[PDB]
Design an enzyme around this catalytic site. Structure first.
Site, mmCIF file in Angstrom:
data_model
loop_
_atom_site.group_PDB
_atom_site.id
_atom_site.type_symbol
_atom_site.label_atom_id
_atom_site.label_comp_id
_atom_site.label_asym_id
_atom_site.label_seq_id
_atom_site.Cartn_x
_atom_site.Cartn_y
_atom_site.Cartn_z
ATOM 1 N N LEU A 249 0.825 -1.199 0.000
ATOM 2 C CA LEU A 249 0.000 0.000 0.000
ATOM 3 C C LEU A 249 0.864 1.256 0.000
ATOM 4 O O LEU A 249 0.447 2.307 -0.485
ATOM 5 C CB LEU A 249 -0.925 0.000 1.218
ATOM 6 C CG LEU A 249 -1.925 -1.159 1.283
ATOM 7 C CD1 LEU A 249 -2.766 -1.050 2.543
ATOM 8 C CD2 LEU A 249 -2.807 -1.135 0.046
ATOM 9 N N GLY A 250 2.071 1.140 0.543
ATOM 10 C CA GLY A 250 2.987 2.265 0.544
ATOM 11 C C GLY A 250 4.243 2.001 1.347
ATOM 12 O O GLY A 250 4.188 1.441 2.442
ATOM 13 N N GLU A 251 5.381 2.410 0.798
ATOM 14 C CA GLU A 251 6.662 2.275 1.481
ATOM 15 C C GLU A 251 7.055 3.616 2.097
ATOM 16 O O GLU A 251 6.258 4.569 1.974
ATOM 17 C CB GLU A 251 7.735 1.817 0.490
ATOM 18 C CG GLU A 251 7.416 0.492 -0.193
ATOM 19 C CD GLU A 251 8.233 0.266 -1.454
ATOM 20 O OE1 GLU A 251 8.126 1.086 -2.389
ATOM 21 O OE2 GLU A 251 8.981 -0.734 -1.510
ATOM 22 N N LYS B 120 1.009 -2.707 9.045
ATOM 23 C CA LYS B 120 2.192 -1.862 9.022
ATOM 24 C C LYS B 120 3.374 -2.670 9.532
ATOM 25 O O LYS B 120 3.386 -3.115 10.681
ATOM 26 C CB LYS B 120 1.978 -0.628 9.903
ATOM 27 C CG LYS B 120 3.116 0.380 9.856
ATOM 28 C CD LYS B 120 2.768 1.628 10.651
ATOM 29 C CE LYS B 120 3.810 2.717 10.466
ATOM 30 N NZ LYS B 120 3.347 4.011 11.040
ATOM 31 N N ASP C 192 1.077 15.970 12.641
ATOM 32 C CA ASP C 192 1.442 15.935 11.222
ATOM 33 C C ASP C 192 0.227 15.759 10.326
ATOM 34 O O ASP C 192 0.226 14.919 9.428
ATOM 35 C CB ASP C 192 2.444 14.802 10.953
ATOM 36 C CG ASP C 192 3.211 14.991 9.647
ATOM 37 O OD1 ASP C 192 3.804 14.004 9.156
ATOM 38 O OD2 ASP C 192 3.230 16.123 9.112
ATOM 39 N N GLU D 20 7.036 -0.847 5.815
ATOM 40 C CA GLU D 20 6.059 -0.813 4.689
ATOM 41 C C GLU D 20 4.650 -1.123 5.181
ATOM 42 O O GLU D 20 4.465 -1.635 6.284
ATOM 43 C CB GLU D 20 6.457 -1.828 3.614
ATOM 44 C CG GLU D 20 6.470 -3.270 4.097
ATOM 45 C CD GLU D 20 6.812 -4.251 2.993
ATOM 46 O OE1 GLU D 20 7.054 -5.437 3.304
ATOM 47 O OE2 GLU D 20 6.838 -3.837 1.814
ATOM 48 N N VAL D 21 3.660 -0.805 4.355
ATOM 49 C CA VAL D 21 2.272 -1.135 4.652
ATOM 50 C C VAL D 21 1.727 -2.090 3.598
ATOM 51 O O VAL D 21 1.769 -1.797 2.403
ATOM 52 C CB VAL D 21 1.390 0.130 4.676
ATOM 53 C CG1 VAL D 21 -0.054 -0.248 4.960
ATOM 54 C CG2 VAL D 21 1.899 1.099 5.728
#
Ligand SMILES: C[C@H](OC(=O)Nc1ccc(Cl)c(Cl)c1)c1nc2ccccc2[nH]1
Length: 258
Positions: A14-16, A33, A116, A17-18
């Site tokens: 899903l995104g860099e 995650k 954030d 990890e997930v």
């Protein structure tokens, strides 16, 4: 107990990890995650405190490389819904802003600041409900009913409040309010207003001088612009609080059908 029910397949990054994890038996989807290890230990503790419909759910963690089992949001990042130089329809932005406020009110209520907030960290479920994500920078600002002032510089420059760049210590809540204001600006204008809120940044100087005939401000209707004038206030002590955002004219304007 049903066999295999504890097995999850990792189906895609899903995104860099997930990773997207799907349950072998029930096919329930969760986000996992995976972090190769104390900063992560703090994230888990804070996640265990959280239970709100506009905050990414925490299911639990496997110690093993740390594994965080998190709510899967199939709609992706709010970031991707924003069209360059355009933004999105005002009713959609208002709905997202309402749900953002709901999640932030909840966190502040239990004494947590995210620190954030930005569109990359606001995820959407299958119904485009917004969920605040990633508490790796989050910290406690109120405990046993006593407020702790912050001093750690962190966040993301275009979204960060001016006092973080100027003062040794600062209150947590106004900082989150400010970043929500920058998110609102992004949603309505499809551009971020300044590289950072510093006296050396021309775009920020233009804003303090109320030159709202310029972009991004001229792309924003007067009603939401008036709210932004109350949020993006340099002095955090004078900046509008969330209870008063709830009283704002645009915030309460009927815009979007169900
Ligand atoms: C995926 C891509 O995202 C962005 O450009 N993100 C973005 C733009 C401006 C700001 Cl200030 C921010 Cl914070 C995010 C995207 N989304 C679209 C929607 C319609 C048409 C074209 C599109 N391109």
């Amino acid at each position: 107990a049903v066999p295999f029910v504890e097995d999850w397949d990792l189906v895609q990054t899903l995104g860099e990890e997930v990773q997207l994890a799907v349950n072998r038996v029930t096919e329930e989807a969760v986000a996992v995650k995976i972090v190769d290890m104390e900063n992560i230990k703090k994230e888990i503790c804070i996640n265990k405190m959280l239970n709100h419909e506009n905050v990414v759910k925490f299911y639990g963690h496997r110690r093993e490389i740390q594994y965080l089992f998190l709510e899967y949001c199939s709609g992706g990042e709010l970031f991707d819904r924003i069209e360059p130089d355009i933004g999105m329809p005002e009713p959609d932005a208002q709905r997202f802003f309402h749900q953002l406020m709901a999640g932030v009110v909840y966190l502040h209520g239990i004494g947590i600041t995210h620190r954030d907030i930005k569109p990359e960290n606001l995820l959407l479920d299958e119904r485009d409900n917004l969920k605040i994500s990633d508490f790796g920078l989050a910290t406690v600002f109120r405990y046993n009913n006593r407020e702790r002032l912050l001093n750690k510089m962190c966040g993301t420059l275009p979204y960060v409040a001016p006092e973080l760049l100027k003062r040794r210590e600062f209150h947590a809540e106004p900082v989150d309010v400010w970043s929500c204001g920058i998110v609102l600006t992004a949603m309505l204008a499809g551009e971020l207003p300044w590289d950072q809120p510093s006296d050396s940044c021309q775009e920020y100087s233009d804003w303090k001088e109320k030159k709202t005939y310029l972009n991004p401000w001229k792309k924003i209707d007067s009603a939401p612009l008036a709210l932004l004038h109350k949020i993006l206030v340099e002095n955090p002590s004078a900046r509008i609080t969330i209870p008063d955002i709830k009283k704002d004219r645009w915030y309460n304007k009927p815009l979007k059908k169900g």
